[PDB]
């Protein structure tokens, strides 16, 4: 019910991706409903999805379906990679990091979707400071505050090439291992 | 006849009397007699020294119940590091120094601190664990609060409401002893530090394992939107699990925050103003659960609606209640014809606090004036429909007892129209806190006023107080002066200077809070144009050196970006002019070269750093602070002669 | 109930305001180690007390310093406890807010410390945080 | 340990061979560099410190003679290296104190294996033919002020003169660290920097240079960076960021901290 109420918008919008669209439907349906992975024995709002490809545009797109469809709200830009425009080097923000403006996005926004496009281009730092919000369930900003995760909707883009074990480098196959569901967009 | 002639029972029970700690180190140095009976009847001691000569530590005071190693400089520095293979002795140390505790309060930088001082005294009765550091890295959860279960305990009290941890600590380390948890009578997890409260798994686990408690507070969330919130279903466990409970205070993270941007729905982008997890007949089964109960404390971020049923059963359900404390509550008093309702029939109440209640209006205040003819302080917070006349209706009816009033953020009511409704009671009041407003549209002797509180806007003058009708205070000693806002985005203040020179009006004026912390600025760097938060800290602290203070709490303002509160050179020259200053604690960061400023002040004895916010600075690198320069700062200052 | 005091004179006193007395309700009833006004004012403590109040007890402190010791060592021979906790919470009145040199002299109290003993408590008393 | 380490308040961080040395502008300390240690300690050996002007040392250990010229800041950098076996180190310094650093590399070249500039320049003063720096009358109103401020302090009163108050909207913020020092050690670093002069001495450093400046700073100009790539005896390069104000590696750390490991790790310059 829930799957297909926002597949057939996801379709609508990235009908080039009918079979990754209908998996992360699936997952993002059952995440939800509480038929996802569990931070141990207790159970977890948030859900970190991994979605590669190398269709940027309908990445994009596609997870601002997701956003306007299960919270109707816009997504929130914030890039790692080789991909800053002019509106993601935000001075406005002054002293804060990547790291810091994941969490400072994350406090203040505890019900919405996280965008991460170019994983594999991030910092080994801001890769290290993910695991660690993944494992503990919170996630800590550059000065050491710790900020609980919610329930927000987290997908990173990556670029390898159902998401393939055999495409995953070794340095983020542990990354692959936790996080809640990989989605391999095609090309 | 003299005292030296006395039995010494009566000397020892005069000397017993004796709480005021300067007046106790005077009486030690008057004669031999005198300083054995001083040494013996000494209970409380706070240490004040530093970690390097902590083996220089005095052994006269063999009686002290309860001691507070908290305050050891440098303030937050970790007591025993398990790096060093001697921490062990000081263990040993504080045993032999102070064999008599009953009350140890220890600030917990490591895990190696607790496993080493805590155990020494098996009588330990009460314990209090401060961290406002970072949480260090555990295998497990709750592993270092495991550390507290002792094969011979009877810890009665725990206090965790400045312990910074996980919430999932707490219910590991409960869980690991029966024997430990149900010795418990007292559990105290009201810290405003946690990301976010404790679940409604964590605190009925809690409440299981402590069937005994007899005071329970805790930073508990509510938020419906989150998952695993706590709802009626942990309230009701509360109740079942601890039918003892004399106090419980249940609280929002958000609302024990000290900035009222964090908890004030009409200051939040939206947040909050929607129905929570709570009902009127849940909390009737939970009233109806605690009959020992006396005072209550419920605080929410997220409006519960239609509780006047709750409180009306509060009345005949809970006959020893005397304290009450809503937050967000909406509908507690609505009166219909004459007839009293909601919490106007708690007619034992002492204490009221009221906080954010959109239905509450002048009849709803003259209604709890009437029903609650007993009320001694009367709190209320964010109530727009309020107005002058039913606040002095209210002070009025309550005329014979109320002596402490809180007014605070009332659009209707300003600091002039406040003064004016506790007209009534203006020989009466004792302790009064109003919100410097001065925009509010629309004899004289406050002679038992003792200490006022304030809140002002960033920007605003304090000059106007006098002319608002706080002109006579003969017998005020203490004023509390709190400042909040965002001053990016402000101008140059066209006035000099914040007014502190008004507060001369004041002849017993001896003791101050400045509380500048809620202001966020620039520290270092302004973009273009503008001002850093050095120019805000010469105009709120110019003229504090002509006041005849003899103690100043100091709250640098904040940068919030880059994280600092450093001390700056006008603030620093400022508060170096206090010549009479006993005491000046600065909360926030300074460098050597403006603390030994201080040095000026010859009066001067009690100074301390203390980084008592989250999160506190994690070593040397991260801030201006250097462990050299506390203990070459302590060293100049007790050199002087 | 009559009493007696030391010097002879003999005062009378109620059920109730004997009995606030340990050593009086344990206990003619000759009373030789008090004076004449001592029992005056302490029955007359006792007699309020079966009877807000703090101003009562403020003005009963207007006496100057031996009948108010007088008082102490009669509180004590008696055995009550209201009227000892009082009077040695305003003898340590006195205490607070006096430097060592003022309460010696405000107390006749000799001076027996050594510069370097008077050193070494103030070094000790350099440990609390006043 | 021993004396020098606990003068400067020198810390060690990180693994590794090669070693990093932090140095931070007049006015701040080694806090300033909170930000960018986390980067560095993976694969690199940090060394921090502060200076002897900086607010967190002793201020009885500053001799007023030894560091009123730029060669005792040298040495001292020189003593420190020296005490903590390093050698072929990168140093990152700031404004004023790479120039320090420079002129340690002149002195013992051994010691330094590249130098990274941030926003540099060899002289603050502008003259008729070189425009390198400010008119001497804007630093002129830096030095009233802060010869007033120890005039006050010398008398008991507050210091309350700021660089808030300074009119050049420059001055303000560049001069916003020097009111961080005790006034007569914020006198003599000024001065010891109105005095400064190393264009003579570009030549004889040797060591690869990286400049790294802003886009259009208003206070440094961005042709002091061709100056010195024309006028240092070694190999260097210019990189240009777009940020702004006297701390980028402070105030914009998403864009500075990447262009400064880029630096660090490139060596072909």
Known sequence: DLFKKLLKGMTEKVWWQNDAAAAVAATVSQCKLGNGKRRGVLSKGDVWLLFSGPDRVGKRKMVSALSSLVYGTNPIMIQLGSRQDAGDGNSSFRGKTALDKIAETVKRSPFSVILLEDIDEADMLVRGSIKQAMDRGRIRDSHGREISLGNVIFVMTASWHKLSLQCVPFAFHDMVSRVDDAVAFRA | ?641 | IVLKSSDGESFEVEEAVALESQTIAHMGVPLPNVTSKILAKVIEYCKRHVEDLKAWDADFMKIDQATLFELILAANYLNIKNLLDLTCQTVADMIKGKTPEEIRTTFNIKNDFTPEEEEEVRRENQWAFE | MSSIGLAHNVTILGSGETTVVLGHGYGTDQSVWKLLVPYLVDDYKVLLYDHMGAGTTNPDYFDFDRYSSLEGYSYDLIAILEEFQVSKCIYVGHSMSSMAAAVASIFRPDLFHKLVMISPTPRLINTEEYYGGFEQKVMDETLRSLDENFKSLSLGTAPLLLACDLESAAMQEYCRTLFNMRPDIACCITRMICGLDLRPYLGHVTVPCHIIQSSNDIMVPVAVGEYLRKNLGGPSVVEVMPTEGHLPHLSMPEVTIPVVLRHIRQDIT
């Open chain 2, 1 to 641: 006849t003299a005292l030296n002639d006395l039995p010494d029972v009566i000397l020892s029970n005069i000397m017993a009397g004796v709480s005021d700690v300067r007046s106790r180190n005077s009486a030690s140095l008057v004669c031999h007699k005198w300083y054995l009976l001083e040494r013996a009847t000494r209970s409380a001691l706070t240490l004040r020294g530093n970690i390097r000569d902590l083996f220089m530590l005095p052994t006269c005071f063999q009686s002290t119940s309860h001691l507070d190693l908290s305050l050891i400089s440098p303030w937050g520095h970790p007591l025993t590091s398990a790096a060093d293979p001697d921490s062990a002795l000081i263990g040993h140390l504080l045993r032999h120094a102070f064999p008599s505790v009953t009350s140890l309060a220890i600030y917990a930088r490591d895990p190696s601190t607790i496993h080493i001082v805590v155990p020494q005294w098996p009588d330990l009765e009460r314990l209090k664990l401060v961290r406002w550091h970072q949480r260090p890295q555990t295998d497990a959860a709750g592993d270092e609060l495991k550390l507290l279960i002792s094969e011979c305990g009877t810890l009665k009290s725990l206090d965790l409401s400045s312990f910074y941890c996980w919430t999932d600590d707490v219910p590991a380390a409960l869980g690991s002893c029966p024997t430990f948890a149900a010795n418990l009578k007292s559990l105290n997890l009201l810290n405003s530090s946690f990301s976010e409260g404790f679940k409604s798994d964590e605190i009925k686990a809690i409440t299981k394992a402590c069937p005994n408690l007899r005071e329970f507070r805790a930073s508990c969330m509510f938020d419906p939107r989150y998952i695993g919130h706590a709802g009626d279903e942990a309230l009701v466990s509360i109740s079942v699990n601890c039918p003892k409970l004399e106090i419980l205070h249940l609280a929002d993270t958000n609302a024990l925050s000290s900035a009222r941007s964090d908890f004030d729905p009409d200051e939040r982008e939206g947040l909050g103003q929607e129905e929570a997890k709570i009902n009127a007949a849940t909390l009737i089964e939970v009233f109806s659960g605690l009959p020992l109960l006396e005072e209550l404390a419920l605080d929410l971020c997220n409006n519960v609606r239609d509780s006047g049923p709750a409180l009306e059963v509060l009345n005949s359900k809970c006959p020893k209640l005397k304290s009450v404390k809503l937050g967000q509550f909406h509908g507690i008093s609505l009166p219909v014809e004459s007839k009293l309702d909601g919490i106007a029939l708690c007619q034992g109440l002492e204490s009221l606090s009221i906080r954010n209640v959109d239905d509450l209006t002048d009849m709803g205040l003259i209604a709890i004036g009437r029903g609650c003819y007993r009320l001694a302080k009367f709190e209320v917070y964010g109530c727009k429909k309020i107005t002058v006349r039913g606040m002095r209706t209210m002070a009025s009816l309550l005329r014979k007892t109320l002596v402490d009033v809180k007014i605070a953020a009332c659009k209707k009511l300003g600091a002039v129209q406040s003064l004016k409704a506790l007209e009534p009671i203006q020989d009466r009041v004792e302790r009064l806190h109003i919100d410097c407003d001065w925009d509010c549209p629309d004899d004289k002797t406050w002679a038992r006023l003792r200490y006022v509180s304030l809140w002002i806007f960033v920007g605003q003058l304090l000059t106007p107080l006098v002319a608002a009708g706080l002109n006579d205070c003969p017998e005020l000693e203490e004023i509390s002066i709190k400042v909040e806002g965002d001053c990016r985005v402000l101008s140059r203040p066209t006035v000099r200077e914040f007014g502190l020179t008004t507060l001369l009006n004041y002849p017993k004026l001896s003791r101050m809070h400045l509380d500048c912390g809620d202001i966020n600025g620039y520290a270092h760097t302004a973009p273009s144009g503008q001002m850093d938060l050095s120019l805000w800290e010469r105009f709120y602290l110019i003229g504090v050196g002509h006041l005849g203070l003899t103690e100043l709490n100091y709250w640098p303002p904040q940068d919030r970006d880059v994280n600092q509160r450093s001390l700056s050179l006008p603030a620093a020259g400022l508060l170096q002019e206090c010549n009479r200053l006993r005491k000046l604690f600065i909360h926030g960061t300074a460098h050597e070269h403006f603390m030994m400023f201080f040095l000026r002040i010859e009066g001067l004895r009690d100074v301390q750093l203390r980084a008592d916010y989250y999160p506190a600075p994690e070593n040397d690198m991260s801030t201006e602070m250097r462990a050299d320069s506390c203990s070459r700062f302590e060293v100049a200052l007790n050199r002087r002669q």
